[PDB]
Paper text:
Peptide titration experiments defined a dose range of 0 to 10,000 ng/mL for [name]-[name]-2 and seasonal coronavirus with the highest affinity (e.g., [name]-[name]). EC50 for [name]-[name]-2 S was comparable to that for seasonal coronaviruses. The 9-mer peptides were identified at the equivalent position of the [name]*24:02 structure. Although electron densities of the peptide backbones were observed, those of some side chains were poor, particularly, Lys4 for three peptides, Trp5 and 7 for CoV2 and 229E, and Pro6 for [name]. The conformation of these peptide backbones overlapped well. Of the nine positions, the side chains at positions P2, P3, P6, and P9 were involved in the [name]*24:02•peptide interactions at the bottom of the binding pocket. In contrast, the side chains at positions P1, P4, P5, P7, and P8 were directed to the solvent region and oriented differently in the complex structures. Thus, these side chains are expected to directly interact with [name]. A comparison between these 9-mer peptides and the peptides in this study revealed that all the peptides anchored to the binding pocket at positions P2 and P9, and conformational variations were observed at positions P4–P7.
Here, we identified the [name]-A24-high binding, immunodominant epitopes in [name]-[name]-2 spike region that can be recognized by seasonal coronavirus-specific CD8+ T cells from [name]-A24+ UHDs. Furthermore, to elucidate the molecular basis of cross-reactive [name]α/β recognition between [name]-[name]-2 and seasonal coronaviruses, we examined the structure of [name]-[name]-2 peptides and the relevant peptides of seasonal coronaviruses bound to the [name]*24:02 molecule. The crystal structures of [name]*24:02 and three peptides, namely, [name]-[name]-2, 229E, and [name], were determined. Overall, we found that the potential of cross-reactivity may depend on the interaction between [name] and the structure of specific [name], i.e., [name]- A*24:02.
Author numbering:
A (entry chain B): -6 to 99
B (entry chain C): 1 to 9
C (entry chain A): 1 to 274
């Protein structure tokens, strides 16, 4: 089965993190940055307690000097002590969607 | 300000 | 320091789902200011920084016109490349373009760029002298010969040394408060036990602009480079950037390590120790 991929494949590097250091009850932004990948088609979702958050926005598609692509997905949120957040990424180089949990110290 | 001429490979 | 303007354009074929999608974005240094998306409804070049909105309708009309023509040029270049390589029309292929200029602290032209990549790899590029081309394979040499015969290097150099520079200078002036700033990195160190024998020391840089930065780890004073995990510099979303570097440390040895931070908004380079 063919995939719709040409050229050397590069797996995305995934980071999930907040705009400002987290503080329960204060509004913040939850970011999922994916970078260094090829081809450019990619799927990113932010998860709140395992459920897709519905109006995440994202940067316009751009690329670095070495031609590999990067994208920022982001949504306003107000963290709490119990709510768990993650970023979920699908790309042709991954055997299944990758889930990266938000760690308030990363 | 964008370039004014692209052309053909 | 110096400044740069860059446009990055991407065309992606999608066989069986219509015509290739074209995205273009404009940057001054690490601040995006325009976008164009051939799949969007406006069919206009659109602003993406505050300081560019003050531009009149004459600007948005000529820019929209220039970027739409480029989108049509690269849609045909995708078809041409398919022939040069005799590739199947069922495959999805990518064509990327980067062009722009750098000025020095006087507004003097430092360098110009005008280059193409096909399926993620160099295709043809205008050399630093702005007078000849680098062609990365036999298909690109066909284009090189054509573009030599048609004086394309002369055409693009005229753009890079004139228009490109005039625009960058105008944007630097118009957005002095946002573009001619440096924000120094705020820095700290976090400590993460792994087991009972090992802990991660992480060295953090937050809130800095521009994006370029250097973070290194030392142990007794010698470079710890291949035992360092170093993430990609990442946008905060408010216009500043973030980065960390980490090392695994044996219990009790934390005080042997030093983190080192270099950034243009810093007067002198920083040293951090646990």
């Amino acid at each position: 089965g063919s995939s719709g991929s040409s050229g050397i494949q590069r797996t995305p590097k995934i980071q999930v993190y907040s705009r400002h250091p987290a503080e329960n009850g204060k509004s913040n932004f939850l970011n999922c940055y994916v970078s260094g990948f090829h081809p450019s088609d990619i799927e990113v979702d932010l998860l709140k307690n395992g459920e897709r958050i519905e109006k995440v926005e994202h940067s316009d598609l751009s690329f670095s000097k070495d031609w590999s692509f990067y994208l920022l997905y982001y949504t306003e949120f107000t963290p709490t002590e119990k709510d768990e957040y993650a970023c979920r990424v699908n790309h042709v180089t991954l055997s299944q969607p990758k889930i990266v949990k938000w760690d308030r110290d990363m | 300000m964008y370039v004014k001429w692209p052309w053909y490979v | 320091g110096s400044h740069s303007m860059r446009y990055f354009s991407t065309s992606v074929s999608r066989p069986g789902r219509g015509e290739p999608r074209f995205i273009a974005v404009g940057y001054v240094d690490d601040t995006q200011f325009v976008r164009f998306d051939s799949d969007a409804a406006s069919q206009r070049m659109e602003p993406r920084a505050p300081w560019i909105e003050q531009e009149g309708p004459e600007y948005w009309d000529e820019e929209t016109g220039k970027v739409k023509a480029h989108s049509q040029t690269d849609r045909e270049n995708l078809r041409i490349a398919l022939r040069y390589y005799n590739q199947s029309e069922a495959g999805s292929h990518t064509l990327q373009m980067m062009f722009g200029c750098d000025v020095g602290s006087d507004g003097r032209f430092l360098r110009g760029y005008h280059q193409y990549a096909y399926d993620g790899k160099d295709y043809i590029a205008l050399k630093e002298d702005l007078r000849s081309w680098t062609a990365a394979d036999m298909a690109a040499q066909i284009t090189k010969r054509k573009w030599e015969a048609a004086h394309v290097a002369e055409q693009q150099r005229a753009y890079l040394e004139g228009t490109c520079v005039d625009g960058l200078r105008r944007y630097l002036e118009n957005g002095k408060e946002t573009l001619q700033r440096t924000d120094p990195p705020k820095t700290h160190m976090t400590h993460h036990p792994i087991s009972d024998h090992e802990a991660t020391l992480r060295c953090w840089a937050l809130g800095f602009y521009p994006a370029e930065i250097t973070l290194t780890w030392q142990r007794d004073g010698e470079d710890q480079t291949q035992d360092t995990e170093l993430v990609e510099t990442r946008p905060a979303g408010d216009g500043t950037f973030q980065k960390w570097a980490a090392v695994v440390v044996p219990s009790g040895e934390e005080q042997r390590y030093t983190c080192h931070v270099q950034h243009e908004g810093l007067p002198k380079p920083l040293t951090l120790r646990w």
